[PDB]
Design a protein around this ligand. Structure first.
Ligand SMILES: O=c1[nH]c(=O)c2nn[nH]c2[nH]1
Ligand SMILES: O=c1[nH]c(=O)c2nn[nH]c2[nH]1
Ligand SMILES: O=c1[nH]c(=O)c2nn[nH]c2[nH]1
Ligand SMILES: O=c1[nH]c(=O)c2nn[nH]c2[nH]1
Ligand SMILES: [Cl-]
Ligand SMILES: [Cl-]
Ligand SMILES: [Cl-]
Ligand SMILES: [Cl-]
Ligand code: NA
Ligand code: NA
Ligand code: NA
Ligand code: NA
Ligand SMILES: [Xe]
Ligand SMILES: [Xe]
Ligand SMILES: [Xe]
Ligand SMILES: [Xe]
Ligand SMILES: [Xe]
Ligand SMILES: [Xe]
Ligand SMILES: [Xe]
Ligand SMILES: [Xe]
Lengths: 295, 295, 295, 295
């Protein structure tokens, strides 16, 4: 037998950082969960019990805190690139670092119509994530994403003209509820190293904001022919607005809301144009994916 | 042996309702999870296998949908009271109904600075809940609550002057992070029946909004001496603003964020006034409760 | 305003303890999650910011570890009683302690048909729990429970003869699937203090084992007329077998498995006596409760 | 823009099937959660709103139930292969099917030392899974796995001789607790189609059982030098025992249990050889992966 692939590290490292502006008194907080996995010339720890090649996962944890102390943690694309680069430069035998960061929302509170200097609220479990792969001699690959963005529209979604055969019971519809949890990922062109990532720093937050805006606007405004057609429109627009993105991937559950026929009870009308009360279905759900790239 | 207490019903009934304004085209959605448990002269179903006394839980589920079809579902205090009353009036041998409702947020989307007519976002897992107990000959008891409101302040929290003995290691502090998930419940004076609940309908949404506002403002502005002292201030204010509330209960976890000493690494300073990077602790957590009533 | 009730403490304190037999080499592990909440003359911490009355929740955490170090942690009824008593004896102004313990399963592994001396498996998320309320001058109240015991029987469950009215669509059945997650609680007669709890130590594990055995046997053997009738039979037997129990409470979800009519597809027969493939329903579910005591 | 990749289908389809032996009266239940995603010539549904190419996800759901009705559901490797093949044979424009199955445990109950004919218990949340990729003209690729197998050993784990530098605080140890949740996957050699999968049917359950046995035995018996070294030993043995497996992958969290120094309290000794009470850590955790193949 032989080791074909190996990676190891620390997962679920929770980190909070505060920035205090001495002049204004304003404080800003950041909270993330970080995973770092390393690869390199480490096969002997598996095959020969040679621990001499292991950077202890506890040390990886220490390194995350130290790096957060000495560097900005925002945008997460930059922080992940700094953290990943550290490992491949510090350790001769480590040749790749894989860094995943989940950013948790802490939104500044408005009290009496003014922004509070040091109080925050978690408005939704929506996350902003990055995956950064730093590979020695191959640069830095960054995938940025938003996830956990849950939306619903109560009309202006249709689904008709699909294949019908002996397995089909679904009725065509010209008016249905559409609800989904959005997972959208944009993959950046490969960067040659940290200097190049630093040069593009302003694009990271701007592209995240654009991806979010395009997602919400397209969802709200499209008279949707299917989840497929609407998601493609979203991806198309993101690619048009940021030339440094190579691909956009969406993964969307179709969370069903079923009509409830109540006509058995005193002829009560609750279907089609009369539908007011629906039963949300926890499972099963549709799952629709697509990756859109350039011509 | 004897049946000392019994209740049965349907839990986890998900319900969505849409209201369509024909004039404006504006649609408004409501989504809830409902539990209804009944009590009454039902002992023989347990002791003698006499099902004749059982209103099937499946029928309870049907009744929830029918009631939502024929009545407003907002405010939830009113809907729960209508639903509970139905059971004690319809069935001679049922003498109490216990209705729990969890309301899920669907907030209208703003697209280009205007409110969208039919598109919604789930902004946070914060819930608005009601517990309604309808007891034949004893009226309607309503407890209203908000839960899952997660907040953090990065300074202006202290904790010193606590008891110190041979079990104590905790250092006094004049500056710490305070973060909690707020669960707040206000208990209404007993109502004589549905007519009285209807007469107070405008107070339900207003009191919820007040409870939320007071919670957020007090949290942000109090230079907190302890979770205990800050929560008492919140409850005091709510009671002062709504005379129909008899008691206010808060239950607050103290979600700890620990300093990380990094001085072992190149004398790095990250504690006390130099603290920037903290480790959020998933467990254990403090849990602090209080019920405040009138003199 | 006045403080009507208050309690505070530490939740989610995870504890592991190992016992090592020096002679045999056999090791036994215990793992629990503990919550301790205190009550007493502590109102001034809420109303006057007087922390002098607060035993810090961090100290409560330390006390749990120290107590586990110096005392047996099994049976949990005894450990909870020792822990609760500690607080009311040590602190003059604390008059009640409320201790909740969840015991996690670590079952010794069998390797090649022999019990391994130091290796364990988590066989199921079933828990054994205790709630211990130690109230100064009123003794020790103990509720013991098992929870998370998930079972299913594929036949020998019926449900017919229930009330039918204009809200009813459910068909009577003489053969259905019955599946539930068992939550069963037995409440001990009040104990005068720790000496009395110690005197009954052997009864705690034996009664837990009996409660489990009776639950499983009755479920498997009863030709069930309803969840109500079957659960009553369980409670009756437990009460008959342990005279020191005052009441037994069961809380049982009815987790539905629905027939799937496939006759639309090539006349395929999958209902009634021909039913083979079913759709488990995640929600809604029935919820059936009963508390059984002595004549 | 262009569609670079697309797949769509139904997730979270819960399925239960019962088999009734008419002779013995013995019933056997199977319960699974199934996901099916399709690929093929479906780009126009995304780009042109052409639904004519879409097999509705609702139809995919129907197909899962129909297929379960007409075929054995065990071993899951065979069922997944039947289900996947169905889609590529039935629909000209569908060229790949991806089927994921999670099998839930329903273990027959022993009542009074005999196996009960129709009553079952969920003993642990351990799962048996399959991923089946059926690609037109490229055969059937099957990855089988077990997951959620949670184990702990209280001694006979060491970790010393790792790299020490200015980022290292971890002390070497010759005696620690080792606890993990096992995720193990074995990848079968490519099969040419359903006939070949059918020919190997007996190997599927046998290899699952072997993988489980080897995992448990090696964990219990290895005097572990690291998670890395122990996991490699497991994978090596599985490969030696089944020649039709090409690779074995393990992914193992290292769930830490920390010593608690209690010496501050009356010189209490609870570290090193005196360690009895430990604090389980919910996060962070080590994460160690390896893929082992043949020379
Ligand atoms: O078994 C281990 N492997 C590792 O890589 C490691 N790092 N810290 N502790 C550890 N334990
Ligand atoms: O056992 C049952 N008890 C009930 O109360 C009920 N209601 N619907 N189905 C049911 N099954
Ligand atoms: O606000 C607090 N209240 C308490 O009771 C406590 N105990 N430890 N830290 C604490 N903080
Ligand atoms: O938007 C949809 N896309 C689909 O592929 C589908 N299948 N069923 N309903 C559906 N809705
Ligand atoms: Cl769908
Ligand atoms: Cl606390
Ligand atoms: Cl039910
Ligand atoms: Cl580790
Ligand atoms: Na390197
Ligand atoms: Na009545
Ligand atoms: Na006392
Ligand atoms: Na095909
Ligand atoms: Xe951070
Ligand atoms: Xe969408
Ligand atoms: Xe609703
Ligand atoms: Xe607070
Ligand atoms: Xe323990
Ligand atoms: Xe039951
Ligand atoms: Xe199944
Ligand atoms: Xe391991």
């Amino acid at each position: 037998s032989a080791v074909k692939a190996a990676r190891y590290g620390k997962d679920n490292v929770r980190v909070y950082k505060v920035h205090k502006d001495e002049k204004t008194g304003v404080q800003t907080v950041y909270e993330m969960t970080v995973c770092v996995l390393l690869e390199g010339e480490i096969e002997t720890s598996y095959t020969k019990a040679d621990n001499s090649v292991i950077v202890a996962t506890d040390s990886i944890k220490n390194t995350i805190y130290i790096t957060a102390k000495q560097n900005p943690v925002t945008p997460p694309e930059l922080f992940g690139s700094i953290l990943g680069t550290h490992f491949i430069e510090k350790y001769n035998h480590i040749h790749a670092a894989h860094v995943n960061i989940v950013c948790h929302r802490w939104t500044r509170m408005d009290i009496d119509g003014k922004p509070h200097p040091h109080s925050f609220i978690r408005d939704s479990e929506e996350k902003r994530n990055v995956q950064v792969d730093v590979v020695e001699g191959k640069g830095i690959d960054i995938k940025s994403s938003l996830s956990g963005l849950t939306v619903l529209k109560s009309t202006n979604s249709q689904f008709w003209g699909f294949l019908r055969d002996e397995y089909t019971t679904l009725k065509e519809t010209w008016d249905r509820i559409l609800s989904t949890d959005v997972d959208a990922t944009w993959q950046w062109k490969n960067f040659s190293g940290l200097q190049e990532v630093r040069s593009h720093v302003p694009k990271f937050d701007a592209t995240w904001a654009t991806a979010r805006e395009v997602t919400l606007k397209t969802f709200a405004e499209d008279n949707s022919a299917s989840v497929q057609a609407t998601m493609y429109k979203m991806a198309e627009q993101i690619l048009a607005r940021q030339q440094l993105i190579e691909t956009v991937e969406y993964s969307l559950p179709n969370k069903h809301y079923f009509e409830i026929d109540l006509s058995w009870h005193k002829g009560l009308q609750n279907t089609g144009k009369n539908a007011e009360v629906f039963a949300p279905q926890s499972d099963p759900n549709g799952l629709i994916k697509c990756t859109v790239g350039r011509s």
